[PDB]
Structures are given as C-alpha cells and as structure tokens.
Amino acid sequence: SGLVKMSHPSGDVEACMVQVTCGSMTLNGLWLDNTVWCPRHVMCPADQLSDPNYDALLISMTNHSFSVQKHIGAPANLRVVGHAMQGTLLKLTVDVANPSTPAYTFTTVKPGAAFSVLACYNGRPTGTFTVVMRPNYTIKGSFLCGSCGSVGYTKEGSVINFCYMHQMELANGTHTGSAFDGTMYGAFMDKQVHQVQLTDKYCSVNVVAWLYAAILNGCAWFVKPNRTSVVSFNEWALANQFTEFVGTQSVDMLAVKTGVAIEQLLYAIQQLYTGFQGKQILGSTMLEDEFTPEDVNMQI
Amino acid sequence: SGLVKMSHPSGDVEACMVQVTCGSMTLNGLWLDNTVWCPRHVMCPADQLSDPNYDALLISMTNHSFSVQKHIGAPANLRVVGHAMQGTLLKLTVDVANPSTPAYTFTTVKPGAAFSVLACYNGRPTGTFTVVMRPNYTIKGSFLCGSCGSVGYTKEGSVINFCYMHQMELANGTHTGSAFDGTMYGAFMDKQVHQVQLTDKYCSVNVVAWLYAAILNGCAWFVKPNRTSVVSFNEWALANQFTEFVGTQSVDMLAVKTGVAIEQLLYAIQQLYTGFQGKQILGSTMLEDEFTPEDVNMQI
Numbered sequence: 147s148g149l150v151k152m153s154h155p156s157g158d159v160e161a162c163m164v165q166v167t168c169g170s171m172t173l174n175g176l177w178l179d180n181t182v183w184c185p186r187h188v189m190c191p192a193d194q195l196s197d198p199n200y201d202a203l204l205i206s207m208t209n210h211s212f213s214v215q216k217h218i219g220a221p222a223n224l225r226v227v228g229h230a231m232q233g234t235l236l237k238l239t240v241d242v243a244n245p246s247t248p249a250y251t252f253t254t255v256k257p258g259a260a261f262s263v264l265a266c267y268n269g270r271p272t273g274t275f276t277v278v279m280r281p282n283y284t285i286k287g288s289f290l291c292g293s294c295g296s297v298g299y300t301k302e303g304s305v306i307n308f309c310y311m312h313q314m315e316l317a318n319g320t321h322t323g324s325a326f327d328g329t330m331y332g333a334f335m336d337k338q339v340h341q342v343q344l345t346d347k348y349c350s351v352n353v354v355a356w357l358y359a360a361i362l363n364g365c366a367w368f369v370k371p372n373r374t375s376v377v378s379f380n381e382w383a384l385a386n387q388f389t390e391f392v393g394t395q396s397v398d399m400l401a402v403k404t405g406v407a408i409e410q411l412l413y414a415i416q417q418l419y420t421g422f423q424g425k426q427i428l429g430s431t432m433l434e435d436e437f438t439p440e441d442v443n444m445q446i
Numbered sequence: 447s448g449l450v451k452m453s454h455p456s457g458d459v460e461a462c463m464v465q466v467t468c469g470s471m472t473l474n475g476l477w478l479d480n481t482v483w484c485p486r487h488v489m490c491p492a493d494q495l496s497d498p499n500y501d502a503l504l505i506s507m508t509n510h511s512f513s514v515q516k517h518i519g520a521p522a523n524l525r526v527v528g529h530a531m532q533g534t535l536l537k538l539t540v541d542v543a544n545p546s547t548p549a550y551t552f553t554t555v556k557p558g559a560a561f562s563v564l565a566c567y568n569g570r571p572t573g574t575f576t577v578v579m580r581p582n583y584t585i586k587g588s589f590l591c592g593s594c595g596s597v598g599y600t601k602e603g604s605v606i607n608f609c610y611m612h613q614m615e616l617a618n619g620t621h622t623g624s625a626f627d628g629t630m631y632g633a634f635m636d637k638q639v640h641q642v643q644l645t646d647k648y649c650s651v652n653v654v655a656w657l658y659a660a661i662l663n664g665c666a667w668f669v670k671p672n673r674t675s676v677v678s679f680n681e682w683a684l685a686n687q688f689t690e691f692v693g694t695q696s697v698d699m700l701a702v703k704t705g706v707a708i709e710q711l712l713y714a715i716q717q718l719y720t721g722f723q724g725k726q727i728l729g730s731t732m733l734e735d736e737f738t739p740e741d742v743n744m745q746i
C-alpha cells in the first residue's frame with residue numbers, strides 16, 4: 147500500500163542484450179531472433195562525428211565490419227550475415243536466433259507514458275529504472291559512457307513492448323533515443339552538433355494520478371471543495387508549463403474509488419503549483435508527474 | 447549523466463521465486479538449492495492471528511501441510527520432504543534442487559543501506575524497486591495483498607546478497623520484513639497486535655552523497671564556505687531526527703572529486719533542512735536520503 151517508482155522484472159530483456167562492435171566504437175545491441183538492433187552511430191568514425199553520411203557509411207560496411215558478442219548467460223560469438231539501416235538504427239542479421247526471444251512488438255510511446263529501462267554496458271546489464279517520455283521528448287535517466295543501446299520497454303500482457311533505445315546524451319545532461327522504427331524521439335539528430343531541447347512541461351494526467359494515490363494512502367489535506375473545469379485548466383496549463391489534461395478510464399476508476407472528482411484535483415494542482423503549505427504529499431514537497439494513472443491503479 | 451533510483455537486474459532472483467501454500471494461506475517463497483524460505487505466518491490460521499503459538503503450529507504441521515509450486519520458467523512438481531523453523535521464517539526442504547540457484551550469501555543490512563526488491567504475487571514476479579532500510583527498521587515500498595515472501599537482495603560481484611523477505615505491512619506505505627537468519631528487522635512481531643515503530647530519521651551519509659551527486663551534475667548553489675564539524679553535526683543530528691554521520695572512504699572520494707569538504711555539506715544540511723528557497727537539487731524540493739555513497743560513485 148505505497149507508491150514507489152517500479153520497473154518490470156528485467157529477466158526477459160537481460161537475455162536479449164548483446165555487445166555490437168564496429169571498428170573502434172562499441173555499444174549495446176538488442177538480440178531478437180536473427181536480428182540485432184543497435185544505434186547507427188557505431189559506424190561513424192570519431193573523425194566524422196560532426197558531419198556523418200550514414201547512407202555512405204552503410205555502403206562502406208560489410209558483414210565482417212561488425213562484431214556481436216553475448217556476455218550474459220551461455221556466451222556465444224554471433225556471426226553477422228547481414229546489415230541494414232532503418233532510420234537511426236542498424237538492423238544486423240546474425241546466423242543464430244536468440245533462444246530466449248520473448249513475445250515482442252515495436253510501439254512508439256507518447257509523452258507522459260512511462261516505461262522500464264535496462265541500462266547495459268559492454269553488453270552486460272547493470273541496472274534498471276523507470277522513466278517517463280517527457281513532453282520535450284527526453285528522459286531523465288542515469289546513463290554513463292558506453293550505455294548507448296540500452297533498451298526501454300513495457301509488458302502489456304505476455305508481450306514485451308519495445309519502445310526506446312538509448313542514442314545519446316546531449317551534453318546538456320539530456321538523454322534521448324529512438325523508437326524501434328528508427329525515428330528519433332524529438333527529431334534529435336545523430337550527428338554531433340549543438341542541440342537544444344524544447345522546454346519541459348508537467349504531465350497533468352500523471353499529477354492527478356499521483357494525487358489520487360495520496361488520497362488512497364490517507365493523504366488528502368490538499369482536497370478542497372473548489373473545482374476548476376478541464377477546459378479552464380487546459381487554458382491555465384498553456385501559460386504555466388503543463389500538458390493538456392486528457393482524461394482516461396484509468397483516471398475515472400481513481401475518481402470513483404476515492405470519491406474525489408477530477409476537477410477537484412485540477413484546482414489542487416494549481417494551488418500546489420503555487421507552492422505547498424509546508425506539508426508533504428507522499429513524502430514529496432513537489433508535484434510528481436512520473437506516475438501514470440495505470441501505474442497507480444496497479445500499485446493499489 | 448543523471449541520478450535515479452536503480453535496481454539490480456532481477457533475472458537471477460526471478461528463477462528462484464516459488465509459491466508456498468499451507469492450507470488456506472498462500473505466500474511467495476525463495477527457492478535456493480533444496481531449500482524454500484517463506485514467512486512462517488503462512489501456517490497461522492486467520493482466527494489465531496492475534497496470538498499464535500508458532501511452536502505448537504510447527505508441531506501440528508507435516509510435510510504435506512505445505513505445497514510449493516514453480517510458476518516461472520519451466521513449472522515443476524515440488525514435493526515438500528521436510529519442514530523446519532528459523533526465527534520468523536520457514537525452512538522447507540524440497541525434493542528438487544533449483545537448477546538456476548545463483549551464488550548467494552545471507553547478510554543483514556544496516557540502516558541506511560539500499561537493496562533491490564522483487565515484488566511477487568502467487569510466486570510470479572510483477573515488479574522491482576529499490577528501498578533503503580530506514581533507521582526505524584522499516585522500508586517504504588509498494589506491496590499489496592499476497593506480496594509476503596518477496597525478496598530483497600544485493601549483488602556484490604557475481605554473488606546475490608539476500609538480505610530481506612517481506613513479512614507485513616504496518617501502515618500505509620510502511621513495511622517490514624526479516625533477514626534470512628530469521629531475525630525480523632526492528633524486532634517487529636509476527637502476531638496481529640499493536641506495534642508502533644520508532645521515529646524515522648534522515649540518513650545523513652546518504653544526504654551527503656546525494657549532495658555530492660548534485661555538485662558533480664553542476665548543481666552546487668547550496669555550497670558555501672561555511673563548515674560544521676562532524677562532532678558538532680552529530681550533536682545537532684540527535685535533536686533533529688538525523689542519523690549519526692560516520693564517514694566512509696566512499697564519501698572521501700566524492701569529497702576529492704568535487705573539491706567540497708564533508709564539513710561544508712554538513713553545514714548545508716543544517717540549512718537545507720530548514721528549507722529550500724524554492725530551489726531544486728536534482729529536481730527535488732526535499733532532502734533525498736535514498737542514495738548511498740556507493741550508489742553515487744557507481745552512477746558517476
């Protein structure tokens with residue numbers, strides 16, 4: 147009966163992690179069946195990192211240019227028999243299919259959605275955590291050198307939903323990656339160049355869920371009879387760095403169980419954005435937008 | 447590079463999770479070699495919860511009073527051939543040794559130390575998170591009905607360091623369990639009786655580590671030339687709900703890499719405790735004591 151940042155048990159994804167090496171650069175890869183996905187900037191030499199032509203680099207590559215290694219479980223050196231490019235990713239074909247490939251789809255997450263990340267270094271998973279695709283299409287994770295290729299995923303039912311592969315840290319401290327169709331979140335460029343991300347915004351539907359979790363945990367000092375409509379809140383949300391509140395059935399279940407209307411929490415969000423009264427909500431003196439409405443329904 | 451709450455990859459522990467059923471009650475169990483550890487209150491009937499004689503309950507039980515089931519991976523016919531009691535735990539002996547038993551040690555964690563938890567329900571893992579053993583010998587996790595038996599662990603090197611098994615929820619978001627020697631953290635009783643935990647306290651060495659992580663991430667607005675000695679801070683800590691600061695070599699490295707003395711941060715704690723002037727330290731308006739000095743050195 148509490149709310150903590152929770153990640154899916156990584157036992158499925160650990161067996162899929164490999165180490166792809168192309169020349170002098172090496173990063174992580176995802177081994178599903180006879181396919182190994184890895185960020186395409188492993189082909190780029192350090193000399194041409196500012197103006198790389200990945201179309202020409204892919205042409206200059208042969209199957210022997212790449213080296214895939216499996217360090218976890220029973221080790222195995224994978225022979226690369228094919229190399230292709232899909233967006234900002236490499237689609238390598240290996241001679242051995244992963245015997246532990248879980249049921250998987252490739253789905254792109256929207257802002258506000260949360261997913262688990264398996265941080266890996268040299269093809270060895272070291273840690274796992276949960277991040278939210280921020281409205282500026284970035285994630286607030288913990289990535290070090292060589293973590294490129296770490297995989298973000300979900301599990302709807304018995305299917306692992308791959309949705310993120312770590313691509314780069316922007317030197318602003320900003321982590322970003324691409325979906326498994328190659329399209330980089332936020333249209334960030336692979337090349338090394340000055341890149342500034344858009345201004346971040348609070349995920350309004352995640353704050354409402356977090357407040358519902360506090361009420362379910364016996365913390366409802368912030369609940370007042372005052373209400374602000376969803377239409378009026380979205381107008382206020384424009385001029386104060388907040389996302390448009392779009393109610394879902396997951397939020398409706400929290401409204402019924404707690405008995406607190408959504409418009410009651412939208413008003414409370416405005417007052418809480420103007421500062422707390424010194425009191426804490428679930429051990430936090432700040433608005434927490436990292437818990438989705440489905441995350442709250444699950445943990446309660 | 448960032449700083450987040452990070453859990454160990456749960457692949458090793460997922461292969462050890464089983465389901466223990468003693469008559470009408472059912473909880474999770476840890477399957478290591480031929481031994482299945484589980485909370486001893488599974489053999490207690492619902493009508494004898496207020497005052498159970500576990501010495502008499504263990505006598506009344508036989509090997510067929512328990513039934514262990516493996517749901518994860520390849521299911522197995524787990525036959526119980528022996529039952530013993532160790533403190534607040536049951537040491538069941540099964541006819542099959544777990545083929546995926548990792549190298550494991552049993553260690554009691556001290557307050558302030560962090561460890562990863564694999565929450566399970568009916569012997570099936572559902573989520574993972576990291577908790578710090580609070581000074582009042584509780585943990586602030588997210589457990590639901592049927593979560594008892596969930597395992598807390600570390601991984602030093604290639605060895606899983608088991609240190610926690612879930613026992614009971616004391617209040618909303620307040621949980622406690624026992625070490626794998628049987629002794630329950632904080633001497634909390636198994637019976638359903640009034641139990642009040644001690645007043646919680648901030649882990650001073652974890653706050654110092656968390657401030658060092660902010661300095662390494664370019665967030666050092668709180669650093670001032672002022673210093674308060676460890677001896678003076680510990681006197682203040684006694685009357686302000688703080689733990690005695692005992693410097694380690696892990697904290698010394700952060701003091702060298704940042705150039706900020708430990709005494710400087712001890713003074714900043716005594717100022718930030720009163721309040722953050724609307725200024726965020728790594729996106730937090732409160733003192734975070736959930737990051738150990740070893741956790742900061744790893745994530746930087």
Ligand SMILES: *C(=N)[C@H]1CN(c2ccc(C(F)(F)F)nc2)C(=O)N1c1cncc2ccccc12
Nearest residue numbers: 187195289290291292293294314315336337338
């Ligand atoms: C990932 N392993 C590294 C390398 N990297 C990177 C960025 C851009 C490009 C190119 F050529 F422009 F396309 N190539 C490589 C990058 O951003 N890295 C990275 C990623 N996440 C975190 C960190 C932390 C520290 C150092 C490097 C990081």
Ligand SMILES: *C(=N)[C@H]1CN(c2ccc(C(F)(F)F)nc2)C(=O)N1c1cncc2ccccc12
Nearest residue numbers: 147487589590591592593594614615636637638
């Ligand atoms: C864990 N599976 C449940 C059960 N439980 C509990 C059962 C018996 C006894 C006693 F007194 F020893 F006999 N004590 C405790 C308990 O505390 N549970 C539990 C644990 N964590 C979280 C929750 C949340 C909701 C309901 C029960 C929880």
